[model samples]
Target chain A: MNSVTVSHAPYTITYHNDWEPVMSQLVEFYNEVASWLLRDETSPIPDKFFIQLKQPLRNKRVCVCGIDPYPKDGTGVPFESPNFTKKSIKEIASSISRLTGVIDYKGYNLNIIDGVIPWNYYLSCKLGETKSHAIYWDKISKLLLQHITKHVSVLYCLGKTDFSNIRAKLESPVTTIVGYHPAARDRQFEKDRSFEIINVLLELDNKAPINWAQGFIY
Target chain B: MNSVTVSHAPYTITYHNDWEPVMSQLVEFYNEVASWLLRDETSPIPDKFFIQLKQPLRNKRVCVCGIDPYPKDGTGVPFESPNFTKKSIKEIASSISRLTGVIDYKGYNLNIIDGVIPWNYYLSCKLGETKSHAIYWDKISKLLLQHITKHVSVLYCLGKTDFSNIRAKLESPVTTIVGYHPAARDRQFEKDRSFEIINVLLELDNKAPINWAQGFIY
Candidate 1:
C-alpha cells in the first residue's frame, strides 16, 4: 500500500482499500486541487455561490466531497489538446465550476479535503492513455475506509460510483445520504431537493441547519 | 504568420502574433488561459464591469484593451504555480479574480482577442532556446496596426513590455494609455484605487460607460 502526506485541515479520512506505490501522485493531485477550489483569498465569496439557488447559504452544514477534480489540462480525447483556444478552455472550467452549488458557505465550515484518496488519478488511469491505471483503484479504496469511523453529521455521496463503493459501510442512524453532484448536468439537485436532504440530516443529528431548503430549517 | 481561425463569435483573437511560421499549439494555449481566467460561461457579470471614475474625467476619452483574455486560473502569480500546501496558490487565484471582477460571474464581453505575442514565448526566445526571436516586428506590427484601426476605441496598456513595443503605431485618437498588468502584487496600479485609470478612458471615448469608472468603458 502507498500513502501520501497531505495537510488534512480539520478532519480526517481513512482508506477502506489500498493502491500500489507508483499511483501515489493521484493523492498529491487531489490535495492541490482541493486547496485551490476553496478559500480563494483574492476574491469575494458570493453571498450565494450559485444562481437559481438564490439564498445565501454560508452557515449551512455541508461537505461536497467528490472523487476527483479535472486533471492538469489533459483530456482523454486524443489529438485534441485539452488546453486550447480561450473559449474551449473556458467551457471546461465552467463545467467544473457547476460543482459550487453543493458547497455549504457557512456550516461544517466547508472546505474540500483530499478524502485521503486520489480518484482523478484513477479516472485518468481508466480513461487516459497515460500509463498509470494499474495501481489507481487500490489506493482510493484504502482512503475510503478511513472515512467510515470519522465524525460526519451526514455523508452526502456525490457520485454514484462513490455511493456504490461506500453503501455497505453505511450503518443504521449513522446518516449516510445520496445526492447529485453539483457538477452533474444530467442530474442536478434543485434547491428544495437539496434542502430536503439537509433537513433530514439535521433531524438525525438533532440540530437545524441555518439554511434549510426553502427557509431556515425548522 | 500563424493565423487563428476565428470562431463564429462576434469577437475573437488569433494565437501568438502572426509570425509567418505559426506554431499550431500556441493558439490553443492562449484560449485555454483566457477561459480559465474569465470563467465566462457560468458566472454572472459583477458591478465592477461598470466604468467608474475616482475623479470626474474630461476631454481625453480613455479606453483599455488587451490582446487576449488570458485564462489565468485567478491565481495571482502570473506565469507561476500556486504551490497549494504552501498557501501561495489560493492567494494567486483570488488576486487574479479581482481583475474584471470575477469575470461577470460567467464571463465578460470584453472583445478581448487572442494576443499574437506570448510573454513566455518571448522569454523562451530571449533565452535563445527557440528561433522565435527571428520574427520581424514589422510584419506583426502591421497586423496589430490593422486590428487597432478596426477594433479599438481608446486603449489602455496593462503591461509595459507590450505597450512599449506598440509605441510606434498606437496612433492618434487611438489614445494609447498604459497600466501595470493586473498581477495582484504589481504595485504599479493603486491596488485600492478603483477606476482610477478607466475613468480617463471613458472621456477619451467621449461616451459614458455603464457606471462611469465602475464599468469597462464609457
Candidate 2:
C-alpha cells in the first residue's frame, strides 16, 4: 500500500512582542512540533492529549480566539523541561485575562483557526502571506464563526479592527464585543464606541453585567 | 537690490499614511509656520502665540515631539478642499485646526532636527529623505534648536525609538513624556495614562485647572 502524508497545519496568530521575544520562540517550537508529527504518526502528541484532557471546552460561557499558537514553553511555564523552556500559554492567557477583566473561555481552543490557519507551522509555511494589515479580515472571520458556536454566549474582539470584521461576519448575534486592542493607548470617540457596541451586544445576550453595559457599552 | 530665489528643501518626516492626504496639507501649514520663524533673523518663536488660535485643539491635549502631527485624521478622510487648499501661514494653521481638532503650533515649538534647512526647502527636503532615519533626526533637531525657546515645559516623544537623539539635546529642565505615536494602536503603561499625561505635565508646571489650561495655555 502507498503511504499518504496528511498534513495538519498550525494556526496563524497575532501577538505583541515588546519586553520578551515570546512569539518568535513559538514560531520555532511550532516548526519542531510539525517535524515530530511528520516523523512519527503514532508519536502520542501532547497537543491531542492536552486538548482532550480539557474536553468540556465548548461548555464555557465564552471563547477566546488567539491569532497564533503561543510560544512552546508549554501551557504557561516555559522552563520546566529542556525540550521547551519559557513562559507557558496558560500563564500568559491568565495574565491577559486579568489585565482585561474578561473570563469566559472554558472550551476555547488556543490555536485553532477554522476559517484561517492554525498556530503550528513547518519551516516553510508561515501564518500570513502579507504584512500586519493583511491579517485582520481573514483571521477575524474564522474567529467570528467559532464564537457563533453553541457553547459561546459572548465574543470579545479585543481590537477595533478585529471587532469591525467580527461585526460584519456574524449578523448581530450574541454581542460580538469589540474594543481597543489591548495594545491601544488612546480610544477616541469613534474608536471607543466600538468597544461599547460589543459590550452592549454581550449584555443584551445575557452574558455580561448590565453596569458595564450602561456605563461603557455604547 | 536683489530678490533671493529661495529653493525650499524638504523636512525629514516619518510617514504613516493612515490619515488622508489632507493631513499632509496640515503639515505643510505647520512647516510654513515654523519655517517662517526659522527664516526670521529675530528670535525663536514662543509656543503660545504660534498655536494660540486653535485653543484646546478640539478638546484633546496636544502631543509634542515626533508625533505624526494631526493624528485624529489617521483614518484618512476624503481629501477635502477646505483642508488642503492653499493659504498663508496663519490662515492655513487656523483652518486646519478647525477642520481637524489637532491644534496649531500651540504653546511649544517642537525641537525637530531639520529646523535649519531654508524655509523654502523645509518640507520637501526633509520628508523626501524618509529612507535615511539618521538624516531625518539631524534635520529635525537642527530646526528645533534654531526655533525653540527655553520656556517650553514638556515634550511627548511620539515613538520610543527616536528618544535617544532627542534626549541628547535636552537642557534637563523640561519634562520628557513617552507614548506610542498617536495614530498607533499600542498602549503605554501607567494606567489609561496617554491623554492624561499631557494634563499632568501642565498641572505640574502650575498651569492651573484643566479647563482654563485648555483654552489659554496647553
Candidate 3:
C-alpha cells in the first residue's frame, strides 16, 4: 500500500484545483470497488486503477469515456492501447485527427481538450471481463458521474452499451453524446460525430474547441 | 564577382535540372539589365539581381510573382521582408495563412509551392524604385514569363500593374491570376481569392496543393 503505481495505483491522479474538492473521495470509492484485486494477504500489490494524467483536468468541459480498460495490455487510459496499431485505438486516433488538423503527437500532449486521460465508466473489471464488475461498481461509477454531469460542458460516452442506464442516473446539463465505440466490428466509429459535436459545444460555451486528437487517441 | 552574393549575385540560383536550360539565360539577362548599378569603377560591386532559392524549381507547377524587389532591405527572396510588420509583407502573410492551416513558418521552408523564392517581373530597380527598371527589363521579364507560361500550371501575378502588356507577349496556356498587390493601401489582399484559386487549380492539375502560406509568405 505504501508504493507501486503507473496504472496500478488508483489513488494517484492529476486534476486541476477545481477537482481537488472531490477527487480524494472518488479515489476512496475506487479503492473499495477494486479491493478484491489487492486482497491477497501474501502479496503487496496495491494496484487499483490505470489512470495517470500528466496534465490537470479542467472543470465544466469536454471529456471522453470508453466502456472499460482492456483486461490485458490495458494501460488504464481509455482507448489508448499498449500498441497504437490495434483496432480500438487506431480508429479513434483517425477520428480525432480528422477534425483537429494536428497531424503529430509523439512527444506532444493534447492539452486543448480537458481529457487527455479518458475515463472508464466502470473502474475495474475481472480478467477478460468488462461487464461483470460494473454491477458491483455501480455506486462508485455513479458517484463520479454525478460530479461529472454537474461540471462537464460536453460528455462523450463512446460505446454501444446503451448509456441510457448510465444517463438516467445523472442530472446532466451538458450535451452528452453516446456514440458507437471504436472497438465495434461494424466500423461505426468512422461515422461517429462525437468529435464534431464536442467542438460545437465548446464553441457555444464561449471557449476554444479542444484539440482532442493530435495523432493521440482518448 | 565570386565573393559578392546574397541578393547581389545574379549568377547564384537554385534550379532543378528542368530549369537549367533557361535559368542561366535569365541570370545573364538580369546581369545586363542591372549593369548600370555596378558602373562605379572603384566599387567593383558585382550585385546584379535579387533572387536566391535554397530549393530547386519544379516544372509545370504553380509559382508566384511580385512586381519587383522592394529595392530597400530586399533579401533577394520575394515577399520576405527584413521586418515582417510592414503592410505589404504582412498582408500577404495573412492571406496565405487563412487558406492553409499552417500557422508556423520560422525555420521552415515551404517547398510545397514551386515558388518559395518568388520571381520579380523586373529584376533590378533604382534606389527605392520598383517601376523604372521594368521598361529596360521587359525583354528579360518576357523571356522569363514565356518559360513560365509554358511550364507553370497556375501563375499568380500579384500587383496592380496591368500584366496585359506582358500577357500579350506570351503564347500562354496556364491559369494566370492577376490579383491585387499586397502593397495596396486599399487592403485588397485581405479579400484576394488568389490563395483559394491556387488550391483549386492544383486539384485540377492532379497535383498536391501547394502549402503556399504556412505562416510563411512566398
Candidate 4:
C-alpha cells in the first residue's frame, strides 16, 4: 500500500495510500491558505500540520476526535493549542492532569504542542466556517475514525460538534465521552466533567496518567 | 577491616575501620569547629560535607580529585559550587561540558550539590587555611588516597597544594593530574588546562564527560 511516512521524535506517522485523494485535497487547500496568509503581514503563520499523540500509535490509549487548531497561532497539530499558550490544549490537559492526580512543585507547563498524543485529522478553512467545512470534513473524518478505531480503545469528541453524522462509518466499538469544548461558556463545568470522563476511560483502559514533572524541560 | 560506610547515589564509600583514630580525630575537629562557629554569629557555617562522585562508583569513569566546595554554602559536596550560585563547580562543569562537546539546548545548571559523579575526598578549613588544615588533614588525606586508589583509575588534583606531604602514604597505581584550582588567579588559564586534563583522563579511563542537560531537575 502506498503511504507517506514521517516522524517527530517518539511519534511516527503513516498516512495510508488509500487516503491519497483526501491528502491531495488537503495539500491544495493548505497551499491556497498559505498564499493568502503570506499576502497579509498580520496573518498568523500556522504551525506545520501533523499528527500529535502523547506516546506512539502502537500504544495509543485514547483517540480524541473532532479537535481543530486554535484559530490564533495553533500549530496545526491536532488537539494542540499554541506551544506556550493557555488555550484548549492546556484546558484539556489540565483536566486530564487533575484526573490523573499528577502534581509537581514546579507546576506543569504542559507542552501543548506534543503532550496529548491524540490521533489527528485535518480539514481547515477560515474561522466561523465550521458548517461549510463539515461538508468537506465528513470524508476526512471517516478516514480518521477508521485510522483511530484500529488502535485506540476510546473515542472522545470535544465540544458540541455532533459526531452522529459519522457514526455509521465507524467499524469498531469504542467507549466515548462527549463534552463541551474548552472555549464554551460553560467550559469550567464541562472541564470538571472531562476530568471524570477521562478518569473512567483511563481506568477502563488500565492506563496511568503521565507524570507532569517527568516531561518538564529543565 | 573496620570502615565507615556512606553513600552518595552510585558511589558507596567504605572508610576503612583501620582509620578509627583519624575518624575520631575528625569528629573532634568538626565538633570544635562547630562550637567556635556557634560562639560567633560572624563565623562561617561550614558546608555539610559528603562524598562526591559522578555516575556511580562501580561505573566510575574519571575521578576528579582535590576539588573542594567553596566555604560559603558549599553543601559539603566536592566540586559543587553553592547551589544557585555561580562558583568553581559551575566553572569546572562548564569547562568539562565544552571539552566533551555535549551540547544540550537546555543549559546545564550543574548542581553544585549532589550533581557531579566523581570520587570525593576531604581536607579543609577556611579558603586560605589549606596550609594550616594540612597538618590536621594529613591522616584524612591519606585515608582518601587509600580509598580512591583501590577503585579509581584516574586521580586529578586541583590547585598547587603539596600532596607530596601525603604522597608517601599512597599504595596504589592511578593516573594523576595536578593543575591550578578553578578558583585561583589566572583561573581562566587553569580552566583551559582542566579541559585538557579531563579530556586525556576521560580517554585513559574510557569514560565520557556527563551531558549536564541530562541531569536537569525537570
Candidate 5:
C-alpha cells in the first residue's frame, strides 16, 4: 500500500474531503516527478522553495498560474521577484490594479493582498529551455488545479498552460481568463480583462473587489 | 507615592537597572505634556501613534532623531512616512547609503534596518507654526536621549534638534552627527558626513558596519 506522503506544501490548505482523489493522484505524480529530479547525486538544478501565499487555500479568491520553474534565480520565493518589469507577477498585479483603480493610500494596506496566492506550485524546466517536465507534469498538476479551483472565484492563466484547457470542467463560476506571458516581446501581457472579470464575479457573490495598488510602508 | 503610569511605548525596551532615574523623570514629563494635549474633551488634534522600532532599545546601533510631531499627515507610524523626498528619514538613509555603498538587493534585508529606528519618539507640535511643543519637550526628551544613546553607537540628528546640543554628555564613543532637515530647499539635506562618521566609529569599536542598502522582499 503506497500511501501518499506529504512533505512540502506551499499554502495553508484545509483537507477538504472532496479533494481526496485529486490528492492521491497528485501525490503519486509528485513522487514520480520528484524521483527523476533527484536521480543524480550531482544534480545542477537546486532545491525548490516557491510559493508565498498571503492567505490559506480555501480563502483564496484568485489564482495566478505561473510558467514553469527552471533556471530559477536565487530568489526562492515565487510570486516575488527582484525584476518587476520582466516577470508576469508584476504584470498581473498591474493589470488588476489598473482595471480596479485601487490606489495605495493611508488606511488601505494593500501591501500583501490577502486571498491571492502569488505563484504556481510547480515550476520544472531544466534549461535546454525544455518544455518536457511541464508536459510530464500536465496530468497531475491539471488535476490539482481542478480541485484547487473549486473554492476560487477567478483564475488567470499567464500562458496557455494545461490547467487553462480544462476550464469548463471547474465548478459553477470561476472566471478563468487566459493571458499572455509577461515576457512576451512583440505585444505586452496587458490585454487581458482578468481584473474586470474578477470584479463582475465579485459583485454577484457580494465579495469586495481586489485593490489595484500597494502602499509604501514596506 | 507617584509611580510611573506606563501606557504607550514605541520600542521593545528592556528595563535595564541603569535606566531608572531617566525613566521616572521621562514619565513625569510625559504626564505633564500629555495632560496639556488631552485638556480639551473635543480637541481638534487626534490620538498619538508614532515610533516603529524594528528591534528593542538596547539593541539599537543607530538613532535617527526626527523633527517634532505636529500637523501630522494621518500616517501614525514614526520612522515611517508617506513621502520619501520630503522627510529627513530618507535623507539620512540616502546619505548612509551613498557613503556606505548600501543598496537594496538580494540578501540584505535593509528594508527596515533592525538596529536603527527610523523616526523620533517625541513629536509634539500644534499650529501657529510653533516651535513651542518642541521647546517644551526639550528638557525631558533630551534626558530621554541621554539614556537611549548609552547603548547606541551612532545618533544622527535631523534638523537642529535640542538633542544635538548635548553630544559631550552622551557616553564616550557615541558618534553624534547633525544634518539639515530633509525638506531643506536651497541645498538638499545631502551634504552630511554622518555615514563616514558612523563607519569610522564602528571600526574603532570592532563592530560590523551597517549595510548601506535594502533588498526587495516585502
Candidate 6:
C-alpha cells in the first residue's frame, strides 16, 4: 500500500514495486473499477484509470493500444481523441510529423504531451467490447504488455482485439503495429494506415520490417 | 534556414539552426517580432515566441526565468499565469513535486508541455518594465543566456532583472536561484523562497552550495 509514484522527464511511474505484484492487483482493480464507474455515470476519474494519460513510463517511444475506457464525456484520457482538445491525438500527431521529415510540420502534439504512451490502461470494456474485453483483461493484459514491451519502441495495436490480445505476447524488439481503431468505421483508413505505420516505425528507428495492415475490429 | 526540429523524451528542439546562429537570429527575431506584435496589439503571436512554451531543447532540468511575455489573452505560454490555467505555473510545480518524492503527487504540468525549457525567451518587455526589459533584451539576452546556461540544471531567477541580467553569464555547474517575480508585490515571500530554493536544488542534483537570495525587481 505504498508505491503510486509518477515523475516526468523520461517518465518515472512507480505503482507497487517488488517486481509488480501485478501493480498491487492493478491498484485494487482500479479502485473497484472506479467505484462502479463513478456511480454508473459510465467513466472518468477512476484515478483517470492509468493515472491520467500524458506520456511517461520512461520515454515510451509509441505504444497506442486503446481497447477500453471511453464511456464518453471526456472518457478518461487514453488516446485522448474527442474533447481532450488534442483532436484525436492529432491523428497520430500528423503521422509523426510526416514520419519525421517534418515537411509542413503541424504535428507531434507534444508527442502526446510526453512522448507517446496512450495504452488506455483498461477498466474493463464496453463500446465495441473487444471480445469479452479480451478475456477480461487477460492476465492484466499480459502483465501490462510484458511491462510495456520492455520500454516501448513501437506497438500500436488499436483494434482486432487490439491485435489479437497482444500478438503472441510481443517479444523481440517491440515493433508490432496493426490498424483500425481511430474510432473505426474505416476510420479514415485507420487513420491512413496508422500514419504509414507511424512513419515507418519512426523512420525505421526500430530498424525496418513493419509489414503493413489496415482495417480490424475484433 | 535548416532547423526546427522537436522531439520528446528528454526533450529536444532545433528551430532554425546551423548549430545555433543564435537560433537563426532567434528565428528572424521571432518573425519580425510576430509581425510587429501582431500589428502592435503589443504581443501574442510573434509565433508565440519560442513557439508556444512547453519545454524542449534537450531535457532542460529547471529554468523558470520569467521577466517578459505576458500580454494576456493566453499570453504565449511561459509562466502561463495571468490565467492560462497553470496558476502561476503551479508554484514551480508544487516545488518540483516536493523535490522529486511525489507525495500525493500532482506536479508534472506536462513538464511545462514539451519538457521544461521555459526561459521566457523574451521579446522586449513592458508591463512593469523590469529595468527597461533588462536593457532591451541585452544582447539577445546574453545570447539566449549563453545558449540556455549550456543545457540547464537549475536556475530559477524570476526577477531582479531576471537575476542581474543572467548573473554574469552563469557558470559553475548551473544551480543559481534568486527570487521576487512570481508576479511579485511580495509574492508570498517569493513563493516561500522559491520553494526552499527548489527543494535544495532537487536535493542537490547540481552537487552543492546554491547560495540563495530573495525579493528583487527591476
Query: Highest lDDT, which number?
Result: 3
Q: Residue-wise lDDT of candidate 3 within A102-205, one digit each (tens)?
A: 66654222233443336777655666655646665677677666666566666777775646444435534344567787776666778776677666556644
Query: Which lDDT tens digits does candidate 1 get at residues B1-218?
Result: 12344222212332333232332333344333333323333111211111111111122233343332223321211132322322222332333346445542322222221211112211112121223232422343334343433434445555555554453443232434444555535554435322343433344234554232122221
B1-218 in candidate 5: lDDT tens per residue? 12235443322223444456576676666666665544422111434332222235666687766655434442434444444433444555566557657665223222366566454535555543434465556676667676667778667666644444444343323445555666666755676455555655555445666655542222
Candidate 5 chain B lDDT trough over 10 residues, lowest sum: B42-51
iRMS of each prediction in angstroms? Answer: 29.4, 19.8, 25.3, 32.6, 30.3, 21.7
Give per-residue lDDT, candidate 3, residue B86: 49
Residues B121-151 of candidate 6 have per-residue lDDT tens digits of: 4654444333334444555655676666667
Model-by-model DockQ, in order: 0.01, 0.01, 0.01, 0.00, 0.01, 0.02
TM-score ranking from best candidate downward: 3, 5, 4, 6, 2, 1
Instruction: Report how far residue B108 has shifted in candidate 5, in Å.
Output: 14
Range of the 10 consecutive residues with the lowest summed lDDT in candidate 6 chain A? A209-218
Question: What is the model-wide C-alpha lDDT for candidate 3?
Answer: 0.56
User: In terms of TM-score, which candidate is stronger, 3 or 5?
Assistant: 3
The candidate that achieves the highest TM-score relative to the unseen native structure: 3
lDDT of 6: 0.47
Model 3, runs deviating above 4 Å: A1-218, B1-16, B23-32, B37-50, B53-55, B101-117, B213-218
Local distance difference test, each candidate: 0.32, 0.32, 0.56, 0.45, 0.50, 0.47
Steric clash pairs (candidate 5) = A69-A123, A97-A212, B69-B123, B79-B119, B102-B212, B102-B213, B103-B213, B104-B214
Model 4 chain A TM-score equals 0.60
Candidate 4 regions exceeding 4 Å error are A1-47, A51-55, A100-116, A119-121, A127-132, A162-166, A169-171, A187-191, A205-218, B1-218
lDDT of 1 by residue, A71-99 (tens): 23333221123234333223322333343
Evaluate model 5: give its lDDT.
0.50
Tens-digit lDDT track for model 4 on A132-190? 33444455556556666566655666655555323334533344444566666845533
CAPRI verdict on model 3? Answer: incorrect
